Design a protein around this ligand. Structure first.
Ligand SMILES: Nc1ncnc2c1ncn2[C@@H]1O[C@H](COP(=O)(O)OP(=O)(O)OP(=O)(O)O)[C@@H](O)[C@H]1O
Ligand SMILES: [Mg+2]
Lengths: 469, 47, 517, 122, 50
């Protein structure tokens, strides 16, 4: 009596006609049925345009193989809603809120629409604040912003998953917070891998996984980030909790938006992305913010097409990123965990106006020493350390000691070594690296700096090696 | 003098690589945009 | 001898049992037709992707559905479509016959044999667009799928359930790599163990028919057609067949994967499937994007490649290993379809023309070639002898600028330069000559163990071959230990080292001198 | 038309046909000149969407069956010396031997201007 | 085409003619203008198919 019916099916794009006074609002969730027993399913459609004459153009979220013209379409009356609450922790969901490991779980939770507005201008924080994670290299050279966005540039085999579990542990144990993982365009193999690693390290109970996979139409890959962000917004606003949101390849969110724009017949912009690229990126990144004492800090994996940082997608993404963490393989091969490249990583709040003067001075001193060491590394490698000067030899030893003390015994390694993870206060890190740069540890052997906490751990590891002071 | 001149030449070649890469990426983006313009122009001419 | 009376009896039983119940059919009418696309008014109950039958046994697929007509892709013999013909509704989506009867056959992208060797005994049918295994149906990729190529098996290992992209310009050896990967499974097949046997599927999209004939001949000469199917959509076939061939090849090999079997599927030039789908979508007047692609082409390829999975033990433990092939142009890996398939797969093998001309064959760029599965897809022996290989090759590549100033280099620098040259000579391999894993372990042990520093770099190849030959004739027990234990113990290392010493004192270089230290 | 004459000489008479074709590409280009007038959306570089399909329908008839030989030899124009243009890039897949001529070798006075690093044979 | 016709009339009488077409690119641009104003589907650089 008040339901619609399919009129056109063109791949993922489905046009539905409704009665004269029952046109669904934009972004509504519609339900159609594919009854062909082999491909029998319930299609979820999202209203994208009002075409006129009671026709609406919707983007399908499942493949439309087997849909018939004239099939009844039910209007739900609301946008795509995901289950929210403490019970979404430890489970895997998709972009629509269906539990993947336990089908049917979460259906009787509170459900929140994935299309929400960022906090009002009255409620935004006018003062930036540093997020103290407890890691030496991060707290010193790449200070994270609380309620900000951190780019992650780690490939395969540099401990990106290990750093992810580490950040989950730190946000859950140092802030009493939560983690939400949005796999935007997640490889199903790597999705299952991450699931079983988070279940093995016993950090899954502190995480909610939302997977919009690669074998899915562009709609779910475009909306999975909003689903996970809605779960995170419930954890922040309603539970009163600090949240850490890991968006894996935000570039796949941009690319899915571009594909959805192409399917809807919209004329492409420059390069080829959607005409509304910056508006969508803003609509997503502006909800990740600090509000009323609580915050959502986001770590996002970024892909740069053709290594072109001026490409519209990374150029639009970097307008919102507050820090950058580059995981290096030359640092992972040295046995330095986390394998954060101290010279390729960077932060925007590494400023005397934010971190202070002593923090900034120690950080710049460490960076200068490390850059000089990297300059000398080629002469050391090709021609030998023996040819160097004596001031250069001193600097090389001091820089090796600093570069090794940047490593830390992570809380994500406790399952493999049993040693509890360290949480070095930022003051202690500043003091330790000041004393390193001065030279107070130029006699201690190198192996006494690998994977330790603050200064007392250093002194004890040294004394256990027959070296004091 | 050869060491100094060769360090200078290496820095000059690195800055030239940087400038040439910027230009190559600029013209790559321009070529993609022009191709899309032609394709959508034909498709609009047919509609 | 010919069974002619049997031929009587066959059609006899057929006609004596023929029946066609006059059931109510839903028909439509062709309104327009051109370039392989036909629009059909009517057919209210037709569904998306449904097969339709035109007059004359012609087939089509209902892609576009709207209130006016139905835009369908003709699957061949399109010059027989006319305005006014009637189109019948089938009631089925695209299905393909599946079974063991497809081993050794060359088939259409519909399950019809095009080799001429008679009809194919089909176990059952399988829909082309069945969903991929769930995220909770899979299992970590842990078993190695040996390609028999030293460069791949050592630097970019492939597991059973992984999708590895073979990407390269053209005439760089992609088909050769995949055919060697297929040929290497012959010994796995002869073992009779369903946990070791790998069934192969080779999908040839857009290839000249003589190229498919040559591929099948290469597979036959190596005895690889006992377990290989060839799904061929030749260059003359419609865009529909070229678009459907990978899905036909992947519908097969899932009947095997879900039976608890292990399959390897090669998609030769997925780029050509992309161009066929783009032709189809531009003829159906769908909105084009970058390079005129329909906008759901990333979906086209990811939906296909996400079905190559490693199932759980609760689902049988089967696996499907995907080897897609992409032809770049002028080494433009930043193009649209290369970007898509690089983003989808688990690792990439970048074959290059410059390396091919330098005599480095297979022309794999070990610097940029990656495998995100990694050492998890290697036996312990290969995992430990090949760990000392990547760093050595990187150091060689960063030192090869000083190849002419070894006098001015540190002793360690010159040692690294020479070891890297020997290692680059070690990873070369003839075509159609894959090596079992224990022989690759012995070769890389020669390389990384320092046992090639005494051999002139222009002899390394020969030396390696000859040594393996010796070990295939005299000391088979070493290879048997490495094959059965998957590891190189210290006793086996000592035995191998002394065998190498004896062979070295028996080896004759080409420069005349001895290769003894 | 010429291919039908050659196919008659191969299938009916059956004796050692030679088929030369000058700038066969012109087939592709003529198909591209009328693709928009026939009402087809243009492909990447302004070519018809049915580029590879028509090139395959034509190029698969130029072949030697078992016992019946046709030694074919075609000239392929490469537009603007760009070997990445879709027409030569699609032609590349139908050939057993390719002699690829360069303008860089033409400018040096070397004739025939064969690029030895690009040419190939099976 | 006018110049070519005037020249062909002489050519077909046994005479030798030399015709210069100064900037045929201007002819191509004029033809592209004519074809775009008749709303014919453009090609590369908006040039007509012919
Ligand atoms: N390992 C090898 N050693 C020596 N020659 C090789 C090797 N691999 C391939 N070749 C030679 O390269 C030629 C072409 O290689 P191949 O056809 O496998 O490349 P391709 O990737 O299929 O390129 P295309 O698909 O464009 O033909 C063959 O004639 C073969 O002889
Ligand atoms: Mg090939």
């Amino acid at each position: 009596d008040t339901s619609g019916r399919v009129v056109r099916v063109t791949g993922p794009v489905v046009d539905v006609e409704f009665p004269r006074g029952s046109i669904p609002e934009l972004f509504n969730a519609l339900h159609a049925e594919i009854t062909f027993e082999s491909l029998a399913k319930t299609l979820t459609l999202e209203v994208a345009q009002h075409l006129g004459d009671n026709l609406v153009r919707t983007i399908s979220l499942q493949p439309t193989d087997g849909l018939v013209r004239g099939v009844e379409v039910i209007d739900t009356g609301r946008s795509i809603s995901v289950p929210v609450g403490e019970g979404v922790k430890g489970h895997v969901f998709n972009a629509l809120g269906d539990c993947l490991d336990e089908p049917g779980y979460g259906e009787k939770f509170e459900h929140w629409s994935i299309h929400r507005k960022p906090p009002a201008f009255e409620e935004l924080e006018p003062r930036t604040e540093m997020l103290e994670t407890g890691l030496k290299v991060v707290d010193l050279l790449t200070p994270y912003v609380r309620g900000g966005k951190i780019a992650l540039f780690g490939g395969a085999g540099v401990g990106k998953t290990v750093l992810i579990q580490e950040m989950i542990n730190r946000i859950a144990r140092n802030f009493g917070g939560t983690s939400v993982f949005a796999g935007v365009g997640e490889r199903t193999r790597e999705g299952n891998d991450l699931w079983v690693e988070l279940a093995e390290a016993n950090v899954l109970k502190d995480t909610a996984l939302v997977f919009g996979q690669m074998d899915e139409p562009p709609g779910t890959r475009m909306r999975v980030a909003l689903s996970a962000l809605t779960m995170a917004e419930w954890f922040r606003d309603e539970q009163g909790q600090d949240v850490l949101l890991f968006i894996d390849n935000i570039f796949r969110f941009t690319q899915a938006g571009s594909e959805v724009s192409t399917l809807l017949g919209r004329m492409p912009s420059a390069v080829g992305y959607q005409p509304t690229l910056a508006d969508e990126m803003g609509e997503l990144q502006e909800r990740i913010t600090s509000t009323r004492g609580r915050s959502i800090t986001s770590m996002q994996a970024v892909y740069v097409p053709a290594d072109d940082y001026t490409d519209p997608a990374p150029a639009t993404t970097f307008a919102h990123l507050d820090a950058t963490t580059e995981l290096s393989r030359a640092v992972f091969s040295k046995g330095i965990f986390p394998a954060v490249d101290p010279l390729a990583s960077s932060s925007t709040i590494l400023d005397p106006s934010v971190v202070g003067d002593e923090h900034y001075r120690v950080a710049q001193e460490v960076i200068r020493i490390l850059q000089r060491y990297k300059d000398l590394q080629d002469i050391i490698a090709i021609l030998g350390i023996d040819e160097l000067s004596e001031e250069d030899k001193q600097l090389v030893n001091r820089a090796r000691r600093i570069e090794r003390f940047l490593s830390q015994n992570m809380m994500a390694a406790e399952q493999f070594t049993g040693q509890p993870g360290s949480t070095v206060p930022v003051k202690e890190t500043i003091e330790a690296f000041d004393r390193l740069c001065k030279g107070d540890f130029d006699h201690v052997p190198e192996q006494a700096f690998f994977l330790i906490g603050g200064l007392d751990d250093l002194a004890k590891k040294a004394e256990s090696l027959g070296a004091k002071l | 003098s050869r060491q100094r001149a060769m360090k200078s030449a290496t820095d000059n070649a690195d800055d030239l690589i940087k400038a040439l890469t910027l230009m190559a990426n600029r013209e790559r983006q321009a070529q993609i945009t022009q191709e899309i313009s032609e394709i959508v122009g034909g498709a609009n001419a047919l509609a | 001898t010919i069974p002619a009376d049997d031929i009587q009896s066959a059609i006899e039983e057929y006609v004596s049992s023929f029946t066609a119940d006059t059931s109510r059919e839903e028909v439509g009418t062709v309104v327009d037709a051109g370039d392989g696309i036909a629009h059909v008014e009517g057919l209210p109950s037709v569904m998306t992707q449904e097969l339709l039958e035109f007059p004359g046994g012609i087939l089509g697929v209902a892609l576009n559905l709207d209130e006016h007509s139905v835009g369908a892709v003709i699957l061949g013999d399109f010059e027989n479509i006319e305005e006014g013909q009637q189109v019948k509704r089938t009631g089925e989506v695209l299905s393909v016959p599946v079974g063991d009867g497809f081993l050794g056959r060359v088939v259409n992208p519909l399950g019809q044999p095009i080799d001429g060797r008679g009809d194919v005994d089909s176990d059952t049918r399988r829909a082309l667009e069945l969903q991929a295994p769930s995220v909770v149906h899979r299992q970590g990729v842990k078993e190695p799928l040996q390609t028999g190529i030293k460069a791949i098996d050592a630097m970019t290992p492939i597991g059973r359930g992984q999708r590895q992209l073979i990407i390269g310009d053209r005439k760089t050896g992609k088909t050769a790599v995949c055919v060697d990967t297929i040929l290497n499974q012959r010994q796995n097949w002869e073992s009779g163990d369903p946990k070791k046997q790998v069934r192969c599927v080779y999908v040839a999209i857009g290839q000249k028919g003589t190229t498919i004939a040559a591929v099948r001949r290469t597979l036959e000469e190596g005895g690889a057609m006992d377990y290989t199917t060839i799904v061929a959509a030749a260059a003359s076939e419609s865009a529909g067949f070229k678009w459907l061939a990978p899905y036909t090849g992947s519908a097969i090999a899932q009947h095997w994967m879900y039976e608890g079997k292990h399959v390897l599927i090669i998609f030769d030039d997925l780029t050509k499937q992309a161009e066929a789908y783009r032709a189809i979508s531009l003829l159906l007047r769908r909105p084009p994007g970058r390079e005129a692609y329909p906008g759901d082409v990333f979906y086209l390829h990811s939906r296909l490649l996400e079905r190559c999975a490693k199932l759980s033990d609760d689902l049988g433990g089967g696996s499907l290993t995907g080897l897609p092939i992409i032809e770049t142009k002028a080494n433009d890996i930043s193009a649209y379809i290369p970007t898509n398939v690089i983003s989808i797969t688990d690792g990439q093998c970048f074959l290059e023309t410059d390396l091919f001309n330098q005599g480095v064959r297979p022309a794999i760029n070990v610097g940029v070639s990656v495998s995100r599965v990694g050492g998890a897809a290697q036996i312990k022996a290969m995992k430990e002898v090949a760990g000392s290989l990547r760093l050595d090759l990187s150091q060689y590549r960063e030192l090869e600028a000083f190849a002419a100033f070894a006098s001015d280099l540190d002793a360690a620098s010159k040692a690294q330069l020479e070891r890297g040259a020997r290692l680059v000579e070690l990873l070369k391999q003839p075509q159609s000559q894959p090596m079992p894993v224990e022989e690759q372990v012995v070769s890389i042990f020669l390389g990384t163990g320092g046992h090639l520093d005494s051999v002139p770099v222009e002899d390394v190849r020969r030396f390696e071959t000859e040594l393996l030959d010796h070990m295939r004739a005299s000391e088979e027990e070493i290879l048997t230990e490495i094959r059965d234990s998957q590891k190189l113990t210290e006793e086996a290392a000592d035995k191998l080292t002394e065998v190498i010493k004896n062979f070295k004192k028996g080896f004759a270089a080409t420069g005349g001198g001895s290769v003894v230290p």
